[PDB]
Amino acid sequence: PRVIVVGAGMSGISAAKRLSEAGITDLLILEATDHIGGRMHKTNFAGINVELGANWVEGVNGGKMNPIWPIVNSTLKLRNFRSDFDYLAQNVYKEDGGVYDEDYVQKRIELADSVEEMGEKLSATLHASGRDDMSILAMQRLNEHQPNGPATPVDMVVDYYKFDYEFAEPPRVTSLQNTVPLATFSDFGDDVYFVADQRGYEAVVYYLAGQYLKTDDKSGKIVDPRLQLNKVVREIKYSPGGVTVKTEDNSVYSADYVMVSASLGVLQSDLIQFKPKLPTWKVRAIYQFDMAVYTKIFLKFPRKFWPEGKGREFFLYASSRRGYYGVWQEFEKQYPDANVLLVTVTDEESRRIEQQSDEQTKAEIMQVLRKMFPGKDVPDATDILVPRWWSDRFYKGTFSNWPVGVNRYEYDQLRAPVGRVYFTGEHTSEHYNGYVHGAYLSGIDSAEILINCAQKKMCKYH
Amino acid sequence: PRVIVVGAGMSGISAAKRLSEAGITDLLILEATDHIGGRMHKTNFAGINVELGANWVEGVNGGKMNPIWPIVNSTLKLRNFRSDFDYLAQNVYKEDGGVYDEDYVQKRIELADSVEEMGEKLSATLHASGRDDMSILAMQRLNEHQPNGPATPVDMVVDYYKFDYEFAEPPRVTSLQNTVPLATFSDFGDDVYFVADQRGYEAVVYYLAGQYLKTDDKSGKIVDPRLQLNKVVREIKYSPGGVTVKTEDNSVYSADYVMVSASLGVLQSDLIQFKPKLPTWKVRAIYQFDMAVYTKIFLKFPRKFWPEGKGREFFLYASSRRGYYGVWQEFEKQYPDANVLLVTVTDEESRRIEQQSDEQTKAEIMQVLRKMFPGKDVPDATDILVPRWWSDRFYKGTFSNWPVGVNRYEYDQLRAPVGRVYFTGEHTSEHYNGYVHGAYLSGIDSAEILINCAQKKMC
Numbered sequence: 042p043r044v045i046v047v048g049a050g051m052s053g054i055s056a057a058k059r060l061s062e063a064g065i066t067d068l069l070i071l072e073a074t075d076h077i078g079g080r081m082h083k084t085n086f087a088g089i090n091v092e093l094g095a096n097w098v099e100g101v102n103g104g105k106m107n108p109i110w111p112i113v114n115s116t117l118k119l120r121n122f123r124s125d126f127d128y129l130a131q132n133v134y135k136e137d138g139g140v141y142d143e144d145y146v147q148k149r150i151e152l153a154d155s156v157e158e159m160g161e162k163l164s165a166t167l168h169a170s171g172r173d174d175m176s177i178l179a180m181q182r183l184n185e186h187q188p189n190g191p192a193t194p195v196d197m198v199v200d201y202y203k204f205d206y207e208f209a210e211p212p213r214v215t216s217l218q219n220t221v222p223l224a225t226f227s228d229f230g231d232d233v234y235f236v237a238d239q240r241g242y243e244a245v246v247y248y249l250a251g252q253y254l255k256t257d258d259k260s261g262k263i264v265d266p267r268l269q270l271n272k273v274v275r276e277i278k279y280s281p282g283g284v285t286v287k288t289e290d291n292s293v294y295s296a297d298y299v300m301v302s303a304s305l306g307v308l309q310s311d312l313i314q315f316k317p318k319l320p321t322w323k324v325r326a327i328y329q330f331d332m333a334v335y336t337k338i339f340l341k342f343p344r345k346f347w348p349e350g351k352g353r354e355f356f357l358y359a360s361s362r363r364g365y366y367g368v369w370q371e372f373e374k375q376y377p378d379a380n381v382l383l384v385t386v387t388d389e390e391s392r393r394i395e396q397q398s399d400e401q402t403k404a405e406i407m408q409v410l411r412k413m414f415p416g417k418d419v420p421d422a423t424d425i426l427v428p429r430w431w432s433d434r435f436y437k438g439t440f441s442n443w444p445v446g447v448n449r450y451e452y453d454q455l456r457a458p459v460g461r462v463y464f465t466g467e468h469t470s471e472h473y474n475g476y477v478h479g480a481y482l483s484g485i486d487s488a489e490i491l492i493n494c495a496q497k498k499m500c501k502y503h
Numbered sequence: 504p505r506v507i508v509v510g511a512g513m514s515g516i517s518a519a520k521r522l523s524e525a526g527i528t529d530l531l532i533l534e535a536t537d538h539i540g541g542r543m544h545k546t547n548f549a550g551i552n553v554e555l556g557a558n559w560v561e562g563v564n565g566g567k568m569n570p571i572w573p574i575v576n577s578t579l580k581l582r583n584f585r586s587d588f589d590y591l592a593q594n595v596y597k598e599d600g601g602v603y604d605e606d607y608v609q610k611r612i613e614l615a616d617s618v619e620e621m622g623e624k625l626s627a628t629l630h631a632s633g634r635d636d637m638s639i640l641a642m643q644r645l646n647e648h649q650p651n652g653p654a655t656p657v658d659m660v661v662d663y664y665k666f667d668y669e670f671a672e673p674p675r676v677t678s679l680q681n682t683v684p685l686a687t688f689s690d691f692g693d694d695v696y697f698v699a700d701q702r703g704y705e706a707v708v709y710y711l712a713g714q715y716l717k718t719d720d721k722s723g724k725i726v727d728p729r730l731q732l733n734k735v736v737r738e739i740k741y742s743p744g745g746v747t748v749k750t751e752d753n754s755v756y757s758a759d760y761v762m763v764s765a766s767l768g769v770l771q772s773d774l775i776q777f778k779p780k781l782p783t784w785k786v787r788a789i790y791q792f793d794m795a796v797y798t799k800i801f802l803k804f805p806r807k808f809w810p811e812g813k814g815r816e817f818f819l820y821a822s823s824r825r826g827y828y829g830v831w832q833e834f835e836k837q838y839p840d841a842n843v844l845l846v847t848v849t850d851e852e853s854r855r856i857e858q859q860s861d862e863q864t865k866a867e868i869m870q871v872l873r874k875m876f877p878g879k880d881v882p883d884a885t886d887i888l889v890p891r892w893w894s895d896r897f898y899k900g901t902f903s904n905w906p907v908g909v910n911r912y913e914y915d916q917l918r919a920p921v922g923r924v925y926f927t928g929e930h931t932s933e934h935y936n937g938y939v940h941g942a943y944l945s946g947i948d949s950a951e952i953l954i955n956c957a958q959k960k961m962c
């Protein structure tokens with residue numbers, strides 16, 4: 042059987058790998074960009090390679106082994122460090138300079154955590170159809186008995202840190218049932234390890250790809266003609282007998298099946314035309330799920346003016362404006378002596394910021410920093426990097442988030458195949474949507490469904 | 504039967520009236536503030552009375568008569584004017600100076616309208632159970648084929664004016680099925696009339712109360728001992744046989760039933776303790792619904808510097824920060840010669856602003872106006888009025904809003920009594936939650952439900 046796989050991110054390379062394993066080697070992987078890895082991709086910033094996209098292996102040291110861990114931590118030995126969030130209470134800055142009293146902050150954190158735990162108990166009891174779901178915010182109101190969730194500067198940045206920094210949209214839009222507790226953590230462990238290796242987290246993808254695609258003996262570059270980069274799929278025609286795939290440069294290919302790995306945001310943007318048009322139930326499923334955006338803004342300074350030391354890696358800015366340049370990370374371990382800082386924003390701020398100049402964003406950040414370190418002579422950043430994933434047509438966002446409103450059956454419709462057209466990608470991960478491991482696993486799962494149809498003549502979906 | 508009514512806002516006065524009409528006159532209305540009317544309430548600003556709460560009779564000129572209209576337009580003849588939003592396209596200001604090209608804006612408005620219309624068609628097809636409901640944002644994504652809804656400053660402000668200015672929360676939190684289209688307009692008509700009468704929109708409530716509560720023949724003030732102001736209820740105990748209600752000043756009252764009309768926000772806050780505790784099903788429905796906040800910031804200036812004239816009443820500021828001081832109104836017709844402007848914000852901005860000083864808010868607003876009217880010498884406002892409804896423990900918000908996730912059945916649980924504890928108010932209105940007419944009809948309905956149970960034993 043010949044199979045075309047659209048996209049060479051983690052799930053597409055992962056799917057083709059699984060297919061190869063089942064003996065389906067008549068493969069054609071069409072990648073829009075000039076490289077593989079997709080949302081796992083590094084870039085040079087001021088002399089160091091930093092990750093534009095995924096940066097952590099999330100879910101480690103738990104009851105089951107996150108499949109991404111061994112590859113990262115053993116097979117490849119990518120440099121990495123366990124993130125420690127235990128000292129946040131000593132690191133929350135007031136909108137107007139200096140940090141808040143630690144004990145005061147630890148209490149607010151402890152309360153936030155208790156509400157969330159109460160939320161996990163409620164979640165376990167909800168009807169599996171998702172029909173009784175509610176937003177994380179509704180759960181907060183219920184447990185705090187207030188007509189609003191966190192609303193003071195400190196409780197709001199603690200909330201953002203707890204939720205938006207993980208999911209990229211606010212608790213009020215997010216499905217409780219599908220995120221609290223989060224399977225990634227329940228199954229794989231509460232820890233997270235930040236990859237900071239010149240080779241990039243994407244090395245995991247090149248590794249997997251190398252397990253079945255031919256590579257150059259001296260350079261090790263993949264040279265297998267089954268991988269074709271710079272090939273943007275623009276149309277997929279499918280029928281009872283097969284599928285035809287056309288790229289922007291006018292190439293046309295034929296296969297027995299096609300496996301689509303492009304992000305949810307790509308699917309929501311109509312970059313790829315389906316012929317015939319996808320069924321309405323499929324279309325609605327696509328639009329109802331959320332494609333979030335998480336912007337890692339890197340900054341480079343001529344000198345250091347923030348604290349370093351035990352518990353200093355992560356720090357928060359308690360703005361009275363929710364989500365305004367709130368979550369900071371300093372790199373004493375990852376990029377020692379580089380004088381870089383990373384402030385993370387998402388959702389509304391991400392969209393605003395992608396639409397204006399980096400110079401304007403830098404100036405906004407400089408006022409924040411000077412307000413945070415009033416006693417320091419804070420020098421202007423000499424370099425800034427604003428990743429624009431939402432504006433990039435091959436991504437249209439950073440990762441999916443399960444919103445209140447999408448039920449179990451609707452999520453299955455999002456994953457479901459349409460004729461000979463199969464879907465894969467993090468947004469099709471049953472329990473790990475939004476993650477690298479979810480992409481990896483979704484690739485295997487989608488391939489297996491295809492293998493069943495193709496090899497075992499089992500073509501019915503659910 | 505003796506019945507205690509908590510709250511003398513529109514629904515409380517409405518329910519007591521309906522009860523009285525059924526002959527249930529042994530009533531005791533306990534109101535927290537020193538006056539009746541609740542969310543319909545005026546105040547003096549700049550030597551003139553403006554509305555801190557509701558200001559429009561919404562849904563007029565349609566297939567059915569909005570019950571409030573005749574009271575306002577005929578019985579009391581409160582002074583009022585139909586709002587015309589037809590010229591918005593000429594009045595959308597750029598973040599940094601002047602208005603946008605009118606044709607460009609009109610087309611953005613049209614796309615927005617068209618998307619909503621398609622949303623209306625879609626909404627009609629969803630199932631009653633609510634199983635296929637989605638947020639308005641999800642509908643916009645689906646109808647426009649994008650991974651996001653309106654996202655440029657202009658599109659965002661148009662979006663904010665069309666939804667948030669009506670519902671006070673963003674489309675992404677809002678239930679499509681239960682707000683688009685909206686019954687209020689579908690039933691009563693598309694127009695809205697702005698009440699600007701010194702007696703206040705609250706006069707409607709006073710008129711209704713005077714139809715059954717005693718009033719002094721000279722003053723006209725209510726003097727019926729059945730109405731007690733400054734009574735903050737803090738505890739309601741109930742048993743299969745009756746109820747006891749305790750107020751903050753330590754008074755204790757007994758009755759056969761209690762009709763609770765305090766806002767959903769008050770109920771989500773714990774100001775009132777129920778004993779025993781309300782059952783889980785009740786509690787979940789309470790916290791799952793939204794109590795929104797809409798803040799009307801009035802400003803007075805030493806002289807006018809904004810345009811007046813045809814289509815000038817309403818204008819938008821397209822900030823790159825969604826919802827930042829975005830919807831403006833000038834009162835050339837309402838308060839001629841007053842030099843007052845009204846800017847409205849909601850939700851996140853409302854909670855942030857209520858938490859800072861008026862001076863700080865004024866200074867933020869002066870920066871926006873100056874950016875809007877770079878050609879003028881804009882004088883600093885002389886006075887500002889920032890209503891703090893969310894902070895007020897007797898309201899904790901301004902009006903409910905229906906969130907994606909809650910279906911009709913769960914919404915109806917809000918209306919459901921618990922034993923002898925009955926509920927009423929805008930958040931219990933079957934199809935008009937969030938409005939003055941919804942509070943009004945809600946009082947009648949809730950009263951009728953208690954009447955059939957209490958008087959005919961049909962519960």
Ligand SMILES: [C][N][C][C][C][N][C][C][C][N][C][C][C]([O])N1=C2C(=O)[N]C(=O)N=C2N([C][C]([O])[C]([O])[C]([O])[C]OP([O])(=O)OP([O])(=O)O[C][C]2O[C](N3[C]=NC4=C3N=[C]N=C4[N])[C]([O])[C]2[O])C2=[C]C([C])=C([C])[C]=C21
Binds near residue numbers: 047226302312436
């Ligand atoms: C408990 N406590 C704890 C605390 C913690 N906190 C922390 C923070 C975290 N945050 C969140 C997350 C983030 O960070 N990130 C990440 C990480 O880190 N980790 C993980 O895991 N993850 C993540 N992410 C996500 C990821 O990356 C994803 O999921 C993946 O990667 C995906 O994959 P897939 O599915 O495969 O997809 P992609 O890559 O996209 O691929 C696809 C492909 O395809 C292509 N195309 C398109 N279109 C087309 C094509 N071809 C052809 N044709 C056509 N038409 C493209 O190109 C590609 O290649 C993340 C992400 C991101 C972005 C960020 C920024 C971040 C993150």
Ligand SMILES: [C][N][C][C][C][N][C][C][C][N][C][C][C]([O])N1=C2C(=O)[N]C(=O)N=C2N([C][C]([O])[C]([O])[C]([O])[C]OP([O])(=O)OP([O])(=O)O[C][C]2O[C](N3[C]=NC4=C3N=[C]N=C4[N])[C]([O])[C]2[O])C2=[C]C([C])=C([C])[C]=C21
Binds near residue numbers: 534543736
């Ligand atoms: C087609 N086209 C369209 C266009 C249009 N646009 C325009 C805009 C609109 N916006 C939205 C709305 C607003 O404006 N507002 C209003 C108006 O205007 N109108 C209407 O209708 N409405 C409105 N609102 C709402 C109303 O006001 C409400 O709903 C009512 O009033 C409610 O009533 P109820 O339910 O009865 O409640 P209240 O009043 O609250 O009452 C209660 C009572 O109780 C008491 N308490 C409490 N707690 C307690 C007590 N007692 C004893 N104890 C205890 N514990 C209180 O005090 C009271 O009295 C509105 C509103 C507002 C606020 C605003 C600001 C606005 C509005």
Ligand SMILES: *[C@@H]1O[C@H](CO)[C@@H](O[C@@H]2O[C@H](CO)[C@@H](O)[C@H](O)[C@H]2NC(C)=O)[C@H](O)[C@H]1NC(C)=O
Binds near residue numbers: 101102114115
């Ligand atoms: C990540 O990988 C390192 C690499 O081995 C692990 O550290 C080794 O663990 C074995 C187990 O006892 C030791 O014998 C080695 O001495 C350890 N190596 C070093 C350099 O200390 C480490 O435990 C791994 N971390 C996780 C979370 O799996």
Ligand SMILES: *[C@@H]1O[C@H](CO)[C@@H](O[C@@H]2O[C@H](CO)[C@@H](O)[C@H](O)[C@H]2NC(C)=O)[C@H](O)[C@H]1NC(C)=O
Binds near residue numbers: 563564576577
């Ligand atoms: C609101 O009330 C005013 C008060 O009457 C209405 O205006 C009158 O309508 C009658 C009906 O024929 C006329 O004969 C009067 O001459 C009108 N009065 C004035 C002052 O014009 C008005 O139409 C009402 N509006 C609505 C929407 O009901």
